[PDB]
Design a binder for this molecule. Structure first.
Ligand SMILES: [Zn+2]
Ligand SMILES: [Zn+2]
Ligand SMILES: [Zn+2]
Lengths: 223, 218
């Protein structure tokens, strides 16, 4: 049972975006589906509801007239069309399956959720990051542990994905939430703590992916 | 419109029961509503935590322990999410939800559950100087990473040759980690000529009156 979303990103005010939720592992045509929304730092807000057949829709007041929930059962795909986007539409969007049942007659709770895709409404321009190595000062390399880093600097559209050595280095990773500087741009950083001995045994490259700008960089960090 | 009212924040003692309230507006009657509670941890989607109508009509979410349960106070029009045997694992946001024919899905504002008595932890501080590639671009960002501190309250001060720095500093609010400790980061944005014009730079992290300091030298 998988709900995989796609189609987020940056959109200018008054613009449009379309979200997709591909489902697998269940009879998609048997379940009601829903879109739920979560503004950054705020709570959950229901957005839209679609029946299993697709002929019955429901929208929240903040969204009536601008969004359209769709469903393609031949390809198990749930759609959320978003037109006349406002700044208040900036949020993380989730799809959610509604359980099947046939006074508690309809239990109807949300059984499975998607991973969430961030939509950002803004007049600002997309800006890809500069990726810089954060190398230690050669004094921690003569200690028992050393800290390597990547600086993902000055990217406007959130989010940015950071991995280390193609996902093969996960133990001892700190990827820090982004700072929003007064220029309107974001910056984040990631550090791996390793044993200093490991500095002579493997290399270190961070995988930085900023999809809104099509910026995928694998940065080697040498000491 | 129907409104589910939840406290934004609620803290409880370890090893004790947490009573998360969800008061329904006069439009609804708790005795006759299916209550859905969802759990959300930082960085993940919400998951179904507890379906509760009545004592004989419970349903725990997949992977949810038996320590949790529900209740209803009809004289308050309030539903309750009860979590006994409270552990640090239970620190999350809990959302109350019902369905109504007018406003189909109605969520409560959510409650951040805090488990008390967690050990205090000093911040671990790492200061990085600007990279060579950044210097070649006539810029220099000093990066100060602060991790594994508890409680989630720090304050950062930057120094250049001991002198306080005011311009070009941007610090994040603290953030919960996977281990319920906090993380934060501070950035010193400078030009390349501002850098290398001082003997050294210091990041200074204060946590409940104690201070950790790291320095880097050009
Ligand atoms: Zn301390
Ligand atoms: Zn750590
Ligand atoms: Zn100075």
């Amino acid at each position: 049972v998988q709900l995989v979303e796609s189609g987020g990103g940056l959109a200018k005010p008054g613009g449009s975006l379309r979200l997709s939720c591909a489902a697998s592992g269940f009879t998609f045509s048997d379940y009601y589906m829903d879109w739920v929304r979560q503004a950054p730092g705020k709570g959950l807000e229901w957005v839209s509801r679609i029946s299993n057949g697709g002929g019955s829709t429901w929208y929240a007041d903040s969204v009536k007239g601008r969004f359209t929930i769709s469903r393609e059962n031949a390809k198990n795909t749930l759609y959320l069309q978003m037109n006349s986007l406002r700044a208040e539409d900036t949020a993380v969007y989730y799809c959610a399956r509604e359980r099947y049942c046939s006074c508690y007659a309809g239990t109807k709770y949300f059984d499975y959720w998607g991973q969430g895709v961030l939509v950002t409404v803004s007049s600002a321009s997309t800006k890809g990051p500069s990726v810089f190595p954060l190398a230690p000062s050669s004094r921690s390399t003569s200690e028992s542990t050393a800290a390597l880093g990547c600086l993902v600097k000055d990217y406007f559209p959130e989010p940015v994905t950071v991995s280390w050595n193609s996902g093969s280095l996960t133990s001892g990773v700190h990827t820090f939430p982004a700072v929003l500087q007064s220029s309107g741009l974001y910056s984040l950083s990631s550090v791996v703590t390793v044993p200093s001995s490991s500095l002579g045994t493997q290399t270190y490259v961070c995988n930085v992916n900023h999809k809104p700008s099509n910026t995928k960089v694998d940065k080697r960090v040498e000491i | 419109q129907p409104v589910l009212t939840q406290p934004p924040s609620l803290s409880a003692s370890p090893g004790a029961s947490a009573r998360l309230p969800c008061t329904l507006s006069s439009d609804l009657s708790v005795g006759s509503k299916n209550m859905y509670w969802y759990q959300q941890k930082p960085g993940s989607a919400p998951r179904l935590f507890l379906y509760y109508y009545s004592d004989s009509d419970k349903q725990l979410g997949p992977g949810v322990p038996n320590r949790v349960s529900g209740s209803k106070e009809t004289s308050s029009n309030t539903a309750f999410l009860l979590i006994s045997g409270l552990q640090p694992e239970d620190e999350a946001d809990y959302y109350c939800q019902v369905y109504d024919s007018s406003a189909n899905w109605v969520f409560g504002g959510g409650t951040r559950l805090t488990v008390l008595g967690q050990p205090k932890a000093a911040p671990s501080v790492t200061l990085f100087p600007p990279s060579s590639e950044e210097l070649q671009a006539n810029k220099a960002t000093l990066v100060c990473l602060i991790s594994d501190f508890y409680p989630g309250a720090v304050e950062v001060a930057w120094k250049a040759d001991g002198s306080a720095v005011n311009a070009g500093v941007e610090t994040t609010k603290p953030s919960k980690q996977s281990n319920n400790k906090y993380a934060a980061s501070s950035y010193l944005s400078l030009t390349s000529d501002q850098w290398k014009s001082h003997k050294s730079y210091s990041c200074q992290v204060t946590h409940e009156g104690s201070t950790v300091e790291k320095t880097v030298a050009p």
